[PDB]
Design a protein around this nucleic acid. Structure first.
Length: 60
DNA sequence: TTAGCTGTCA
DNA sequence: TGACAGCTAACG
């Protein structure tokens, strides 16, 4: 929900459109850089992939 | 058994 | 768009 939390999560995503699956090291590092919880970080990407990444694939 | 994906509500 | 119950794939 934090406006900042979105930005930090958006960057890594588009910085890894081919491998949008972070590691346990990056998951916590994102959580610390956002203050969110691990579960919050986990769910965000899973939603982001099918709402940000996948739609662009369809357009190709 | 855990990471990830689908379906889905407020 | 952030939640989580439920199903699915990579026997210890």
């Amino acid at each position: 929900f934090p406006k900042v939390a979105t930005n930090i999560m958006r960057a890594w995503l588009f910085q890894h459109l081919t491998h949008p699956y972070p590691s346990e090291e990056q998951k916590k590092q994102l959580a610390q850089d956002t203050g969110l919880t691990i579960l919050q970080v986990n769910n965000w990407f899973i939603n982001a992939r099918r709402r940000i990444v996948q739609p662009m694939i369809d357009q190709s």
